[PDB]
Design a protein around this nucleic acid. Structure first.
Lengths: 218, 424, 19, 55
DNA sequence: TTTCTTTCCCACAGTAAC
DNA sequence: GTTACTGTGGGAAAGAAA
């Protein structure tokens, strides 16, 4: 708390001269908070004073996870620039940093993680890879990067839903286009034997359907 | 027709006070036996559809208060198999608070590896309610009575999950009785069936209550304990044993699989066994041990069948009177993480069936919402000043209720509650 | 093995058998 | 701060634009879906009331 | 060939309607 | 009683995966 009240709101260098203490409610360490409230300076000194940058809070998220969720470009760089920091950290639900970067539509954070060599085909506790969420959120920009950097374009989550499927369900025309361009298989039935063209026809997303019928065939 | 109305501010306060949530519900076996030719192997246990909640009644009263017969306000409903070209069998919910489809079956025509029960629902006066589905169901051509490798799960029961155990007499579908509980004892009513937790207890376990369970799958021999997923009352320490040909074995380390007849050994006494006397569940002994010191022949009616049941759930409310559109789908929220904090405090939700016509409500305050996808949503945590006309910074922990509200008024009670914590 | 599920016991006939 | 604030304004804007496109694309199909649904409800309510007479 | 999984087959044995 | 049937469960038969 004493080192947590001056690192979240020479307030870090004088006290350190407690370190990895987790609160009772959030259970986050000084680092987490310093990462969520985007306190670049404080976060840095916290790592310099040799602090575990992979501790998990009450939800399994590491200081890095908070860096992305809070879109703290500053603290983010500091974490991905640290050798110790685990880039493929996983929350309690399997949520990886790369994924969160493609979900909350953050600037560049994704490619930054991908360049720092992070498992692109990482999957949450549901099977959805980073490329999957990029399809459900119609995040074309991120979808392209995840693809150019080798990503199972036809990977199936637990429900056997392919990246293209979620793109057809959500009606992500822009992303559906990209995926189709990279010769992505469109005849991959989910666990219920339904083609991406069916779910699309169901949601009545005529656009996606039109593609799955004429765009880049044979 | 009266155009949909935005759930007014005052409207919420009212709900938060009453909270008569109309909630559907479903229970079913995670697995189903596929019938070939013109056969018909029903779904056992039979998929039940309760209608819990106090709101259900408040709806009846509200409907009649506008001209509705005991028949025009009586909630009707059917049930079918996913997108199959069959007929949705109806349900008789008259007077009853539930209803089981004792005749649901899937043919071998449906080459689906999985599927899920569809439950169309509407009131007496054709007032649309929506379509409630249940978790997925795997299709098996026959219960692998053979050995089971701990490599292909889903078919292997795990310590903690829920299950159902029934009994089939002389091979007749009219006899079948399921393990049930009521009045304070364990019946066997062939009219009702219940889910029973199946915890795994280490051989060095004590008496009963306040014990400890441990993860892991279940193989015959382990000391398991079955607790009622509803009432709570459970049967004293039991040991499951693989059975076949009216003989309960003692030497079987094989992993218990779906649809596997097995007998239950009571406490560490001599013999005895859990059996059904075509009436209720009473003690027995099964003394015959001539075959092998490890093969204790057991009297019929004790070779219950194992099956792991699941449970679907949907709860809502007509926060703004009737609506032209169905309350389906029902937005469920599993995870609720806080993104950043302070001046940019935002919330990211993750669940299922999320729709772009939704908004999150921090108590009686409606906060801006961003639709990410079918299972992700972003809202903006409203300044604390929206709950404390006096402060500009969290002076004291304030816990407000979270809840999803559609645009036509329908509100879906979550369960989660966001709390304002003083920024350190 | 760290969790703990409580309940409510109920014995049909011949309970003392376990000794 | 004015440099990072811009990063924020742009992010929220994009998210809001996304929601706007999705919600509008959903409401646009509302009728087609709502009508088709009630059409199925009718076919059943007919058998629900007709199955009541044979009682 | 072995080892299962998927399909067929068929007979107890209660139901229903005369 | 007599007939016409029908879910069920165990086993034979045909593939399909070792």
């Amino acid at each position: 708390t004493p080192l947590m009240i001056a690192s979240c709101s020479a307030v870090i260098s004088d006290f350190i001269y407690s370190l990895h203490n987790q609160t009772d409610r959030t259970g986050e360490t000084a680092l987490h908070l310093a990462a969520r409230y985007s306190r670049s300076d404080a976060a840095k000194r916290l790592l310099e004073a040799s602090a575990d940058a992979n501790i998990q809070d009450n939800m399994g998220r590491t200081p890095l996870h908070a860096a992305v969720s809070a879109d703290a470009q500053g603290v983010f760089q500091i974490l991905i620039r640290n050798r110790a920091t685990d880039l493929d950290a996983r929350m309690h639900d399997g949520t990886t940093p790369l994924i969160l970067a493609a979900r909350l539509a953050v600037e560049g954070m994704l490619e930054d993680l991908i360049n720092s060599h992070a498992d692109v085909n990482a999957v949450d506790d549901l099977g959805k890879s980073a490329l999957h969420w990029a399809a459900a959120v119609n995040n074309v920009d991120a979808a392209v990067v995840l693809l150019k950097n080798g990503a199972n374009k036809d990977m199936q989550n637990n429900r056997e839903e392919t990246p293209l499927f979620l793109a057809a369900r959500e009606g992500s025309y822009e992303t559906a286009k990209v995926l189709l361009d990279h010769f992505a298989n469109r005849d991959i039935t989910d666990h219920m034997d339904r083609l991406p063209r069916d779910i699309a026809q169901e949601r009545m997303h005529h656009d996606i359907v039109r593609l799955l019928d004429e765009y880049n065939l044979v | 027709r009266p155009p949909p109305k935005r759930l007014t501010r005052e409207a919420m306060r009212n709900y938060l006070k009453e909270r008569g949530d109309q909630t559907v519900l479903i229970l079913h076996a995670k697995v189903a036996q596929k019938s070939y030719g013109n056969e018909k192997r029903f779904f056992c246990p039979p998929p039940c559809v309760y209608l819990m909640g106090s709101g259900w009644k408040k709806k009846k009263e509200q409907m009649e208060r506008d001209g509705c017969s005991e028949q025009e306000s009586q909630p009707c409903a059917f049930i079918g198999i996913g997108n199959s070209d069959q007929e949705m069998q109806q349900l008789n919910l008259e007077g009853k608070n539930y209803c089981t489809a004792k005749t649901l079956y899937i043919s071998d025509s449906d080459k689906r590896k999985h599927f899920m029960l569809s439950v169309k629902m509407f009131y007496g006066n054709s007032d649309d309610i929506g379509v409630f589905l249940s978790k997925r169901i795997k299709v098996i051509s026959k219960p692998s009575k053979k050995k089971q490798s701990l490599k292909n799960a889903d078919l292997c029961i795990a310590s903690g999950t829920k299950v159902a155990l029934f009994n089939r007499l002389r091979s007749q579908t009219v006899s079948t009785r399921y393990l049930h509980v009521e009045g304070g004892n364990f019946h066997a009513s062939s009219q009702q069936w219940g889910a029973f937790f199946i915890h795994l207890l280490d051989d060095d376990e004590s008496e009963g209550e306040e014990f400890t369970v441990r993860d892991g799958y279940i193989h015959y021999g382990q000391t398991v304990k079955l607790v009622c997923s509803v009432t709570g009352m459970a049967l004293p320490r039991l040991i499951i044993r693989k059975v076949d040909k009216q003989t309960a074995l003692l030497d079987a380390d094989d992993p218990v699989s779906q649809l596997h007849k097995c007998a239950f050994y009571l406490k560490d006494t001599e013999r005895m066994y859990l059996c059904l006397s075509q009436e209720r569940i009473i003690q027995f002994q099964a003394t015959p041990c001539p075959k092998e010191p490890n093969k204790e022949m057991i009297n019929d009616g004790a070779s219950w069948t194992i099956i792991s049941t699941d449970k679907a759930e949907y709860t809502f409310y007509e926060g703004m009177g009737p609506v032209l559109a169905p309350v389906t789908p029902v937005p469920v929220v599993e995870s609720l993480q806080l993104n950043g904090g302070g001046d940019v405090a935002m919330l990211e939700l993750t669940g299922q069936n999320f729709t772009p016509n939704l908004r999150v409500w921090f108590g009686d305050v409606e906060a801006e919402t961003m639709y990410r996808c079918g299972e992700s949503m972003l809202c903006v945590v409203p300044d604390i000043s929206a709950f404390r006309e006096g402060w500009r910074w969290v002076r004291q922990p304030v816990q407000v209720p979270v809840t999803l509200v559609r645009n036509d008024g329908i509100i879906y009670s979550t369960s989660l509650t966001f709390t304002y914590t003083p920024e350190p | 093995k760290r969790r703990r599920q409580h309940g409510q016991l109920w014995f049909p006939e011949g309970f003392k058998v376990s000794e | 701060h004015s440099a990072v604030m811009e990063r924020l304004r742009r992010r929220i804007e994009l998210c809001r634009r996304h929601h706007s496109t999705c919600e509008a694309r959903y409401e646009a199909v509302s009728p087609e879906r709502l009508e088709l649904e009630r059409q199925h409800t009718f076919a059943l309510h007919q058998r629900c009331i007709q199955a009541k007479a044979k009682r």
